[PDB]
C-alpha cells in the first residue's frame, strides 16, 4: 500500500509528518515537494496518466486555480466533515484546510508612529506617505488579501482603500515577504504587509544572524478582525490510491497532523493557535469569517483592481 503526495509546501520538507503516518499505518508515502503552480501545470498535462494521489497547495488563490482546472474529486469523510471548520474547506468537499496563516502588518516603530496602526484601513493615513512598502501583485498572498477586502466591502470601497494605500508607496515593489521584512527592520520602509510565519522564522534564526537582528526591530500588528488564509489538501481527480489518500488527508487534518505541519512552518494549526512561544507573543487573533472559497471567487477581480490602481 502506498500513496503519492504532490505538495506545494516547499519551505522545508514535511518529511517527518509523512514518516509518522507511515509508521502508524504501514502505508508508504512517496512525496514530491515543489512550487504549487508547477504541480498544477504538470497535472493538467498528465491528466489520467498522472501518478498523484493527494495534492497539497498553499493559498486560497492557488486552491481556486486547481479547482477551476478540475484537479480534485469530491470525497466523503465523516472525520473531515465534522473536524475541519466550514470556512476552511470546500462547500462541495473537494479540498480541506490543513494549516492557517495570517497576512499581517509589520512596522518599524523608529520610523512610524505605531499607536496609529490597528487595521489595514489605517495604512491610507497621509502621515505614512512614502513609508509603506508592499510585495508585488503577482503574490497570491496579496491577491487573497485584496479578495478578502472585496468580499466584505465590495469593489467600490476596496478600490478607494487601494488608491489610498498605493498613494503611500514610494518604493519599488518587493519580490518576496522576507526581503520586505528586511527593509522594514533596516528602516528603509516604515510599514509592510507580510505573512506572520516569515517573521517567526527570521526571529528563530532560521535565516541566519543578520535576519534575526533585523526581525527583532519590527513590531508585528495583527489586524482585528484578522484575515486568515490556508494550506489545503485534496484527492486528485484520477487518484489510483484514493483510499490511502483519504486516510492521509484525515491524518493531516487531525490534531496531531495539523500541529505537525504547522510547527514546521510556524503556522497555526486548524482549530487551535500555535503553542510556539515566538508565534504566541504576536498575540491573539479573531477571524473575520470570510470563507476561503470566497477568497477564490474574487481572485480575478482583485487582480483587475490591483492593476487599475497601479499595484505592480
Ligand atoms: Fe509562504
Domain boundaries, the chain: 1-101+230-276, 102-229+277-312
31 labeled part of a ligand binding site:
no
Question: Distance, CA 101 to ligand 1 centroid (Å)?
Answer: 9
CB atoms within 10 A of CB 157: 13
Among 198, 279, 282, 231, residue whose Cα is nearest residue 14? 231
Question: Distance, CA 26 to ligand 1 centroid (Å)?
Answer: 31
Name residue 287's beta-bridge partners: 226
Say how far apart CA 265 and CA 267 lie, in whole Å: 5
11 labeled part of a ligand binding site:
yes
Instruction: Determine contact, residues 122/114, Cβ cutoff 8 Å.
Output: no
DSSP the chain: -EEEEEES--SS--HHHHHHHHHHH-PEEEEEE--HHHHHHHHHHHGGG---SEEEEESHHHHHHHHHTT-B-----HHHHHHS-GGGB-TTSS-EEEEEEEEEEEE-TTTS-GGG-SSGGGGG-GGGTTTB--B-TT-HHHHHHHHHHHHHHHHHHHHHHHHHHHHTB-SPPBS-HHHHHHHHHHTS-SEEEEEHHHHHHHHTTTT-HHHHHHHHT-EEE--SSBPEEEEEEEEBTT-SSHHHHHHHHHHHHSHHHHHHHHHHHTPBPSSS----HHHHTT----B----HHHHHHTHHHHHHHHHHHT--
Structural resolution in Å: 1.6
- Which grid cell sits at 157? 470601497
Burial, 26: exposed, middle or buried (Cβ in 10 Å; 0-12, 13-18, 19+)? exposed
6 labeled part of a ligand binding site:
no
Burial, 127: exposed, middle or buried (Cβ in 10 Å; 0-12, 13-18, 19+)? exposed
Sign of the torsion angle spanned by Cα atoms 206, 208, 213, 219: negative
DSSP 255-306: HHHHHHHHHHHTPBPSSS----HHHHTT----B----HHHHHHTHHHHHHHH
Cell 489520467 -> residue:
48
251 labeled part of a ligand binding site:
no
Sign of the torsion angle spanned by Cα atoms 208, 37, 265, 11: negative
Q: Give first-to-last CA distance, the chain, whole Å.
A: 48
Name the structure determination technique: X-ray
Instruction: Determine contact, residues 193/105, Cβ cutoff 8 Å.
Output: yes
Instruction: Determine contact, residues 7/35, Cβ cutoff 8 Å.
Output: no
Cell 479547482 -> residue:
67
Question: Distance, CA 127 to ligand 1 centroid (Å)?
Answer: 30
Question: Distance, CA 27 to ligand 1 centroid (Å)?
Answer: 29
Question: Distance, CA 10 to ligand 1 centroid (Å)?
Answer: 9
Question: Distance, CA 221 to ligand 1 centroid (Å)?
Answer: 18
Amino acid at each position: 500500500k502506498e500513496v503519492k503526495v504532490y505538495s506545494g509546501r516547499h519551505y522545508n520538507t514535511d518529511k517527518e509528518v509523512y514518516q509518522k503516518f507511515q509508521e502508524q499505518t504501514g502505508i508508504k508515502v512517496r512525496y514530491i515537494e515543489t512550487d504549487g503552480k508547477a504541480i498544477i501545470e504538470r497535472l493538467k498535462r498528465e491528466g489520467k496518466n498522472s501518478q498523484a494521489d493527494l495534492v497539497i497547495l498553499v493559498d486560497a488563490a492557488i486552491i481556486e486555480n486547481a479547482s477551476k482546472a478540475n484537479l480534485f474529486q469530491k470525497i466523503n469523510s465523516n472525520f473531515l466533515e465534522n473536524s475541519v471548520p466550514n470556512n476552511l474547506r470546500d462547500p462541495r468537499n473537494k479540498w480541506f484546510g490543513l494549516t492557517r496563516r495570517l497576512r499581517v502588518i509589520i512596522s518599524n516603530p523608529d520610523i512610524v508612529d505605531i499607536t496609529k496602526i490597528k487595521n489595514f484601513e489605517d495604512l491610507t493615513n497621509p502621515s505614512f506617505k512614502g513609508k509603506v512598502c508592499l510585495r508585488n501583485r503577482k503574490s497570491p498572498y496579496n491577491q487573497s488579501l485584496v479578495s478578502n477586502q472585496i468580499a466584505k466591502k465590495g469593489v467600490g470601497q476596496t478600490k478607494i482603500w487601494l488608491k489610498g494605500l498605493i498613494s503611500n508607496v514610494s518604493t519599488p515593489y518587493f519580490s518576496g515577504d522576507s526581503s520586505l521584512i528586511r527593509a522594514v527592520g533596516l528602516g528603509t520602509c516604515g510599514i509592510g504587509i507580510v505573512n506572520h510565519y516569515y517573521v517567526a522564522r527570521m526571529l528563530d534564526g532560521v535565516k541566519g544572524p543578520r535576519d534575526a537582528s533585523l526581525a527583532e526591530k519590527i513590531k508585528l500588528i495583527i489586524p482585528n478582525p484578522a484575515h486568515v488564509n490556508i494550506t489545503a489538501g485534496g484527492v486528485y481527480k484520477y487518484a489510483e490510491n484514493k483510499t490511502e489518500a483519504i486516510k492521509l488527508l484525515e491524518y493531516l487534518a487531525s490534531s496531531e497532523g495539523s500541529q505537525g505541519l504547522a510547527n514546521k512552518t510556524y503556522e497555526h494549526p486548524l482549530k487551535e493557535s500555535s503553542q510556539n512561544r515566538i508565534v504566541s507573543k504576536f498575540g491573539d487573533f479573531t477571524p473575520d469569517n470570510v470563507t476561503i472559497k470566497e477568497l477564490g471567487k474574487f481572485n480575478s477581480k482583485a487582480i483587475e483592481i490591483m492593476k487599475e490602481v497601479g499595484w505592480n
